[PDB]
Design an enzyme around this catalytic site. Structure first.
Site, PDB file in Angstrom:
ATOM      1  N   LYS B  52       0.849  -1.180   0.000  1.00 20.60           N
ATOM      2  CA  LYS B  52       0.000   0.000   0.000  1.00 20.60           C
ATOM      3  C   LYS B  52       0.898   1.248   0.000  1.00 20.60           C
ATOM      4  CE  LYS B  52      -3.881   2.322   0.535  1.00 20.60           C
ATOM      5  NZ  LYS B  52      -4.622   2.077   1.803  1.00 20.60           N
ATOM      6  N   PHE B  53       1.933   1.232   0.837  1.00 20.05           N
ATOM      7  CA  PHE B  53       2.858   2.364   0.939  1.00 20.05           C
ATOM      8  C   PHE B  53       3.632   2.543  -0.361  1.00 20.05           C
ATOM      9  CE2 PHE B  53       6.786   4.550   2.509  1.00 20.05           C
ATOM     10  CZ  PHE B  53       6.160   5.683   3.035  1.00 20.05           C
ATOM     11  N   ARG B  55       2.794   1.946  -3.487  1.00 19.45           N
ATOM     12  CA  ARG B  55       2.003   2.623  -4.503  1.00 19.45           C
ATOM     13  C   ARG B  55       1.842   4.103  -4.177  1.00 19.45           C
ATOM     14  NH1 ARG B  55      -1.586   1.965  -8.613  1.00 19.45           N
ATOM     15  NH2 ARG B  55      -3.411   3.361  -8.645  1.00 19.45           N
ATOM     16  N   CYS B 162       0.795  23.682   7.426  1.00 19.24           N
ATOM     17  CA  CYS B 162       1.119  23.858   6.023  1.00 19.24           C
ATOM     18  C   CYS B 162       0.642  25.116   5.336  1.00 19.24           C
ATOM     19  CB  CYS B 162       0.651  22.640   5.240  1.00 19.24           C
ATOM     20  SG  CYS B 162       1.527  21.163   5.739  1.00 19.24           S
ATOM     21  N   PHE B 213       5.890  14.191   3.457  1.00 12.76           N
ATOM     22  CA  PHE B 213       6.586  15.223   4.223  1.00 12.76           C
ATOM     23  C   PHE B 213       8.106  15.189   4.135  1.00 12.76           C
ATOM     24  CE2 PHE B 213       2.704  14.706   7.228  1.00 12.76           C
ATOM     25  CZ  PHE B 213       1.874  15.216   6.242  1.00 12.76           C
ATOM     26  N   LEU B 265      -4.771  12.933   7.612  1.00 14.68           N
ATOM     27  CA  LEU B 265      -5.168  13.558   6.357  1.00 14.68           C
ATOM     28  C   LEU B 265      -6.284  12.712   5.762  1.00 14.68           C
ATOM     29  CD1 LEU B 265      -2.484  14.899   6.956  1.00 14.68           C
ATOM     30  CD2 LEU B 265      -1.766  14.450   4.602  1.00 14.68           C
ATOM     31  N   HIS B 301       0.652  25.601  -2.644  1.00 15.65           N
ATOM     32  CA  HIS B 301       1.221  24.689  -1.664  1.00 15.65           C
ATOM     33  C   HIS B 301       1.001  23.264  -2.183  1.00 15.65           C
ATOM     34  CE1 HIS B 301       2.320  22.644   1.955  1.00 15.65           C
ATOM     35  NE2 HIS B 301       1.126  22.086   2.032  1.00 15.65           N
ATOM     36  N   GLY B 303       0.519  20.239  -1.313  1.00 20.44           N
ATOM     37  CA  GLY B 303       0.097  19.308  -0.283  1.00 20.44           C
ATOM     38  C   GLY B 303       0.214  17.876  -0.754  1.00 20.44           C
ATOM     39  N   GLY B 304      -0.106  17.658  -2.025  1.00 18.67           N
ATOM     40  CA  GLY B 304      -0.039  16.334  -2.617  1.00 18.67           C
ATOM     41  C   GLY B 304      -0.384  16.417  -4.097  1.00 18.67           C
ATOM     42  N   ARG B 305       0.036  15.423  -4.872  1.00 23.80           N
ATOM     43  CA  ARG B 305      -0.227  15.398  -6.310  1.00 23.80           C
ATOM     44  C   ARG B 305      -1.703  15.610  -6.653  1.00 23.80           C
ATOM     45  NH1 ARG B 305      -1.182  11.058  -7.186  1.00 23.80           N
ATOM     46  NH2 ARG B 305      -3.264  11.580  -8.005  1.00 23.80           N
ATOM     47  N   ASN B 334       6.778  17.592   0.390  1.00 24.34           N
ATOM     48  CA  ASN B 334       5.996  18.549   1.173  1.00 24.34           C
ATOM     49  C   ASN B 334       6.721  19.043   2.420  1.00 24.34           C
ATOM     50  OD1 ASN B 334       4.108  20.008   2.617  1.00 24.34           O
ATOM     51  ND2 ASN B 334       2.473  18.473   2.439  1.00 24.34           N
TER      52      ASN B 334
HETATM   53  O1  LIG Z   1      -0.035  19.636   3.427  1.00 25.94           O
HETATM   54  C1  LIG Z   1      -0.851  19.901   4.336  1.00 25.94           C
HETATM   55  O2  LIG Z   1      -1.942  20.485   4.156  1.00 25.94           O
HETATM   56  C2  LIG Z   1      -0.513  19.437   5.754  1.00 25.94           C
HETATM   57  O3  LIG Z   1      -0.914  20.086   6.720  1.00 25.94           O
HETATM   58  C3  LIG Z   1       0.354  18.188   5.932  1.00 25.94           C
HETATM   59  C4  LIG Z   1       1.296  18.300   7.134  1.00 25.94           C
HETATM   60  C5  LIG Z   1       2.621  18.410   7.081  1.00 25.94           C
HETATM   61  N1  LIG Z   1       3.127  18.386   8.315  1.00 25.94           N
HETATM   62  C6  LIG Z   1       2.136  18.265   9.192  1.00 25.94           C
HETATM   63  C7  LIG Z   1       2.111  18.216  10.585  1.00 25.94           C
HETATM   64  C8  LIG Z   1       0.893  18.118  11.251  1.00 25.94           C
HETATM   65  C9  LIG Z   1      -0.298  18.065  10.532  1.00 25.94           C
HETATM   66  C10 LIG Z   1      -0.273  18.108   9.141  1.00 25.94           C
HETATM   67  C11 LIG Z   1       0.945  18.209   8.477  1.00 25.94           C
END
Ligand SMILES: O=C(O)C(=O)Cc1c[nH]c2ccccc12
Lengths: 387, 387
Positions: B52-53, B55, B162, B213, B265, B301, B303-305, B334
């Protein structure tokens, strides 16, 4: 962008338009605290340690403190009654999550009610607390509790300490003045739920904190260009400064650990503060041609009786200057960042009720000091309002 | 007094006069992270969790990440490799006390070097990190390491998360514009030392974070009225906003506990952000008569793809808009608050090396977005500078 910057900003000085305060409904008398404290923590037999504590409480010049923590709560949380032999952070975080936003809400509603305008007009929120348990910070939870618009611009001030009462005013001044129509809700909410712990003969400094820190929250509405006959200013935030006293890192400090928040306090704090207070004054008032400190109204973070006595002596302030400050310390103890705001409220109230010509005991200019970890000193120059 | 207020404030827009960045020396290849991560944490036997990780890492669009945590440090701190079976906060706090300021100073020295002026001219410091271990906050320590004047006004931004890369620009704008001559050092320093932990089937909402992260620090010099022929701006901070997406409290969160900082998340984050990003644009640009999102340069920002993909499709952005953004996510992952500043630096650099007419890809106006716990969205409208 012709004139865009000019229209975007505000015209006059940021002004305090309301002050509200709140405290846990549990007044704890200082005269009987030594016995209660050593009993509830299970140290009744340690007479010598209790006598040192009695001594500290007796000289604190604090008659009472409001405390969230009750005998019931402490009895259900043995770990919080220990010193550091077992962890207690998680349990404290749960208490903070509930109590900090609660006091903040209560104090904010009072300030909002005084201000007399719809909360829909609040554009910014500066929220301060010694610590905050999660992400989002407590600023988010407080805004939600108050039903503030989602677009309210928030800023949380955490782990700054006892000087933050000045910090939030310094921050609010720039927000209010650089944004036309801005109305900033400023809140400081503190509780010993995070610092209370059992006594330790090898950490007498922590012992002092157990006798001085109290709970409470303050709330302000700050904005420039108040509406004539609609809004009412009690103080104007004229000028601010912040400085660190060199080579004093361990004077006042804290650490967030598995045992919760621990704090360190050195006996030299009184000397350090008074030895550097004179320069803060000159730097702040030279530009206003003021050199007689007795021509100003005063607001000092009541870190401890000794600090006040030392400042009063070094600057030759007559006995009346620190009356409002000492009055708050006696009735609430050291509520950290919130203290100076309670003192401002006490000041304006005493001025009106004594028939003074200004909200600043009849004087035009005033100074507010915040002291805390660093050692950090926050200087805030205030202007009163005619009555 | 009226003349005093006029002289106290600055004339023009807060401008970014320098950008510096830094990362730990250890570059962690994403293509081999699954094996390393599951090994170092003793999870090689959890094949399904591992697959899972794998992928997640393979679809992250992240090639590498810089990490303070090396195999050596992790071996010397087994408590950190656990999930929640044993406390690890204290060990993490010690790492943070060291690493956050170290990265902060590195990035700051670089920005100061670019700025080209004495550090004695720095009047304010805005310092941001997901968490800070003690009081004073890390802002104090960084100021000390950089040798800043004791009277530099500090503001620590902790546990915002973030979206704080936007928050600090919103704060810096008011500080710079309301204080004539003010030069604000803005720093974001983040490290997974506080978030890294072993994977857990019972907390899959915490698995993606371990793949995305990364560590890094950014530093900017913000000031209004840049000295002609002396200082050089690359962007102006024109307008800002902050808002919370309705009923999305648990979409992005974190908790500071005895096991360190835990986070979560939700899979719904991409949808929530994209379903509200349109209104943010309208509220921000309608006043500038702009409705075509493709006529602006972009900074988002990472945050993810998935977030980037959804935003791109929702606002129908052309393929070129998110290139600088995706480039930073690929090379650094990130880094929380620091991301948008790295992206801004990349944007100006590419612009000047590709022959564009402005630091914003030849376009005049641009937008910068910060996303985080709330779910909160920070909107910062920027204006490029001619090249
Ligand atoms: O990318 C975002 O929106 C996040 O808040 C992810 C994130 C990165 N480091 C953290 C530490 C505590 C909570 C969320 C995050």
């Amino acid at each position: 962008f012709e004139g865009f910057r000019k229209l975007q900003r505000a015209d006059g000085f940021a002004s305090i338009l309301a002050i509200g305060t709140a405290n846990p409904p549990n007044a704890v008398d200082q005269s009987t605290y030594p016995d209660f404290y050593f009993r509830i923590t299970g140290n009744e037999h340690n007479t010598e340690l209790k006598d040192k504590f009695k001594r500290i409480c007796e000289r604190s010049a604090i008659k009472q403190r409001y405390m969230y923590l009750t005998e019931e709560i402490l009895k259900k949380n043995p770990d919080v009654c220990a010193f550091v032999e077992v962890p207690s952070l998680d349990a404290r975080q749960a208490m903070l999550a509930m109590e900090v936003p609660r006091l903040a809400k209560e104090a904010a509603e009072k300030a909002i009610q005084e201000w007399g305008q719809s909360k829909s007009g609040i554009t910014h929120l500066i929220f301060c607390s010694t610590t905050t348990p999660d992400l989002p910070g407590a600023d988010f939870e407080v805004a939600k509790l108050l039903g503030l618009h989602p677009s309210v611009k928030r800023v949380g001030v955490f782990q700054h300490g006892c000087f933050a009462g000045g910090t939030v005013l310094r921050m609010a001044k720039d927000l209010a003045e650089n944004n036309r129509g801005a109305r900033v809700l400023v809140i400081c909410s503190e509780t010993t739920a995070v610092t209370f712990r059992g006594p330790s003969e090898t950490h007498l400094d922590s012992l002092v904190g157990q006798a001085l820190f109290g709970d409470g929250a303050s709330a302000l509405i700050v904005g420039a260009d108040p509406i004539p006959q609609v809004e009412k200013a009690c103080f104007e935030i004229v000028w601010t400064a912040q400085t660190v006293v060199p080579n004093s890192e361990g004077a006042i400090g804290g650490k967030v650990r598995e045992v919760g928040l621990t704090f360190q306090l050195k006996g030299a704090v009184p000397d350090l503060i008074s030895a550097n207070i004179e320069n803060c004054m000159v730097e702040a008032f030279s530009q206003f041609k003021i050199s007689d400190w007795n021509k100003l109204f005063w607001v000092v973070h009541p870190g401890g009786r000794a600090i006040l006595d030392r400042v009063e002596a070094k600057l030759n302030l007559d006995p009346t200057k620190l009356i409002p400050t000492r009055h708050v310390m006696s009735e609430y103890g050291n509520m950290s960042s919130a203290c100076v705001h309670f003192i401002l409220d006490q000041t304006r109230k005493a001025s009106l009720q004594n028939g003074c010509s200004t909200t600043g005991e009849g004087l035009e200019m005033g100074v507010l000091f915040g002291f805390g970890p660093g050692l950090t000193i926050e200087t805030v120059v205030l202007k009163s309002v005619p009555i």
